[PDB]
């Protein structure tokens, strides 16, 4: 039956449904090539399935929200990793070593009082 | 290549070339070029005499070049001799539109004068 995974990166949240199949990928009612113009996003999306070599045996239905191109792509990678490891636990050792199960916790720092940016200070004059 | 009493370049597109007239900008260039149905992507070097005459007919519809400059002078002159505030600002070579004067205002005053 359907297996489910979720992924979060930056302000981006994505949910992935994985089923046994032949290699069909749908992302928001659009093809894989119709959504990501940059090939880097496509590569980072296809990283884990290629690493496990389950490319042509599974079907993927994916939904995304929030963030930008890179954040959404990272969320896709995280969600695929979580769904695949949910399907089979024997790959628990592998997906972790590839640096995918760890959730990227980096975020955007706020603006502080007296500074033009998070850390940029105004120009300083001694005399 | 003789429009409105001046020579015009030959190797550029029509929209770029016609703006060289004093009083004709990009919008005016497009209006004239479309009023006679000539494309924007043709060099005036390769173009016939009849449509040059039509272009002259269409550009003869405005006060351009010297015939313009004349009234501009009076548009200033009447301001200067009347004695209004703008006339005084014109006489002294100082800004007229109420800008800063404690600093800047180089364009209306010129390069700095050492004492």
């Amino acid at each position: 039956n359907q297996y489910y995974g979720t992924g979060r990166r930056k302000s981006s949240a994505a949910r992935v449904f994985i089923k046994p199949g032949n290699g069909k990928i749908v992302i928001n009612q659009r093809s894989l090539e119709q959504y990501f113009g940059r090939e880097t996003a496509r590569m980072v999306v296809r990283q884990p399935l290629e690493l496990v070599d389950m490319v042509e045996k599974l079907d993927l239905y994916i939904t995304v929200k929030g963030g930008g191109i890179s954040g959404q792509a990272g969320a896709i990678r995280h969600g695929i990793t979580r769904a695949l490891m949910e399907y089979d636990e024997s790959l628990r050792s592998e997906l972790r070593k590839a640096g995918f199960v760890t959730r990227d916790a980096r975020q955007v720092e706020r603006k502080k009082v007296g500074l033009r940016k998070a850390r940029r200070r105004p120009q300083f004059s001694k005399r | 290549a003789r429009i409105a009493g001046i020579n015009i370049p030959d190797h550029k597109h029509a929209v770029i070339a016609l703006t060289s007239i004093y009083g004709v900008g990009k919008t005016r260039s497009k209006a004239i070029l479309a009023a006679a149905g000539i494309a924007e992507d043709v060099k005036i070097s390769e173009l016939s005499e009849g449509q040059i005459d039509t272009l002259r007919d269409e550009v003869a519809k405005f006060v351009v070049e010297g015939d313009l400059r004349r009234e501009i002078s009076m548009s200033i002159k009447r301001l200067m001799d009347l004695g209004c505030y703008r006339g005084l600002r014109h006489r002294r070579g100082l800004p007229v539109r109420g800008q800063r004067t404690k600093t800047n205002a180089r364009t209306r005053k010129g390069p700095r004068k050492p004492i």
Binding site: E39, T40, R42, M43, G99 | -
Partner: protein, 152 residues
Amino acid sequence: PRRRVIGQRKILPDPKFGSELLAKFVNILMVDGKKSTAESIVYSALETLAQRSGKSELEAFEVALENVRPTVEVKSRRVGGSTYQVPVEVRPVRRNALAMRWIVEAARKRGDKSMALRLANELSDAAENKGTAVKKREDVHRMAEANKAFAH
């Protein structure tokens, strides 16, 4: 720093070649964070070099990079309160970084119409010993050789 705490940050090989070196070169060429405009120029230059030389697509870049890498540089050291010019060895990562930076700066100062064409010319000259990066490496080498007596 005073603490010796910092470390190495992971980098992703470029998609269509899987080479970390190309990734680093693209980062060095990147400005304003507009990466997508950087690998376009890099790819155009690489394909133009590949078709001009006809040797390969990746080996020409490696040979040009190897032609420029230096092995000695000059720093300052002191024993009795007087500053010197002392020659020191260069680690391989520093060699690659210096070579790439020199190539980029040499490329940025030319009179062509595109940046990719400038890159093609500079990598070609480096592979055939005519670029200004060769002059930089030779000048560094000879300044290091001149101050040889101070080598402890």
